[model samples]
Target: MNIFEMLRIDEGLRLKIYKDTEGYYTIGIGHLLTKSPSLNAAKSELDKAIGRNCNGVITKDEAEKLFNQDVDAAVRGILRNPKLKPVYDSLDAVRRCALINMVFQMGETGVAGFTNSLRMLQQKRWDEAAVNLAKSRWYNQTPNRAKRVITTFRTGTWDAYKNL
Candidate 1:
């Protein structure tokens, strides 16, 4: 299913993504980050940094345009690929949410950096994915960030999709 189709984009969630008083992007269940532009080749650099699969791999502006098309769709593209679906299907709702947050934070190609974790999950090796999930620079760089993502990725179960 197209994940964007599932987003309510409610005022509260919009506030979460668009307007925040706190200097930090960190918020409930997710955080904020600068949107990329499409014309800037920085996206290509980001692709290299993150290893995403953008067709043309345009600039942050292009990315913003794409994001405008549908944030949910963009995220689903990252998580719902043929190779990714099996693994995504295995994740609990919380894990799925956490992964979405990660993909959004990291970008499509950036999220691809979780190759090891994806591989482990695809193999039905939950414990291994859990471990690999914690092995990224993302995990090492952000302590609480890593903790929350890893915790959900490791212990999450299909909890009736309450947060959705």
Candidate 2:
């Protein structure tokens, strides 16, 4: 599957205005309405959602549209990072999506923090890269999703767990 679909599954689709795990006001495919671009770009829509109260809801199509935009932003952010763009460009499709998936969740700076791990991936040292990932706080904090993405990085396949 594509990075967008993977993020939809991993991040989960939200229609109503609600607090996310960290308590930021969020909606529409884990879009944090309190942060950065979402705060400014989606302000009018956020206001609209908030006016509908905590029970406010967005259409699936609208949510997906926002999702695609968020994905686009994430992709651009990754590509913008000088530290990450070359690493990103060196991978296969599944591995590329794996990096995009990570940047989607953690942001460009966060992913760029994985200097050693990213270097391993750049050199196609799959096992070493997986090892670096397994040892990170990101791995412990989000084990399932991290494992799936790491598997994609190492195995070069989208179906890390076919039944997942």
Candidate 3:
């Protein structure tokens, strides 16, 4: 599947106002509306940020545009991260996509926090990296999504839609 398609599944689109799993207010393609610390604060900021009195109704064109910007940011942020950048070019396309997905969700800082796992991937030890991810709280919190991405890391394949 394409990177966008993979993200569409993992991120899920919302044309209107919705709260992400972590309770932050988000909009189309799960884009962040505000960095406010609380939902109430986000509600205030979102009203100002989105400028629609809290009901965000984004068009497909707008959503796609936002997704494009976000994906570009994700890749750049990953490349911009010191630790990941050196190993990034040497990684396979599948592994690169996996990193993008991870950066898409958690930013480079979060992925960078996977210290031992990064070392494993840097050494091209796929099994060890996969196990490291599986043992994390991320796997327990979002097991279904984490499982597929973990498989992608483990096998260096797009771990989605077997029929496709």
Candidate 4:
């Protein structure tokens, strides 16, 4: 049940599932792009997707590249500013990946929009950062994603998110 093995099959399915006209798989390995997972399969699939080669965490850049999206473009447009990444580097790898994953899910406007939260994170203000994190639009909009990233931020522990 290794993810790379699953990805090889996913690659084939991706080739089959994607069309030039539809422009699907834009987020690569994140989210419900085309196929739908039943409740029974959802946990396994998400676990594999999130944990594969990720040590149970993944970055926006990695997520972008995994499904053959624009790594260079995402890096250039999203990660170009020095200020944007200063607080980003303060986090541990798991938390960093979780944050980036949430940001990727929410888009730069949605994710980087957390001004106070980012500043708190820069100051390593764990409690205040957690409070600030919970107040964002993303927290309620994508509760599962929000909770995972926030939990990772707080505990530095990640669970495998695979789709069955």
Give the candidate number with the greatest TM-score: 3
- 30-98: candidate 2 lDDT, tens digit per residue: 877764434344555576644543335687877887788888998888888899899989988889989
In model 1, which regions exceed 4 Å deviation? 1-71, 157-164
Please give the lDDT score at residue 159 for candidate 4. Answer: 51
lDDT of 1 at 27: 21
Which regions in candidate 3 have their CA more than 4 angstroms from the true location?
35-54
Q: Pick the candidate with the highest lDDT.
A: 2
Model 3: per-residue lDDT, tens digit, 1-164?
A: 77788888888888776777776678778787766656666566556754456445666766677789899998888777888897677789888888888888877888888889888888999998899988888888888888888888889877453533
| Model 1, position 126: C-alpha lDDT score | 65
TM-score of each: 0.50, 0.85, 0.87, 0.54
lDDT of 1 by residue, 1-164 (tens): 22332222211232222223323322222223333333234334434433564432334444444454545665568556765566667766656665665665565677766778788765667677778787777777665545655655666642222344
Q: What overall lDDT goes with each candidate model?
A: 0.51, 0.81, 0.78, 0.51
TM-score of 4: 0.54
C-alpha displacement of 47 in model 4, angstroms?
Answer: 29
> Can you tell me which runs of candidate 4 are displaced by over 4 Å?
1-28, 31-78, 159-164
Q: What is residue 23's positional error in candidate 3, in angstroms?
A: 1.2
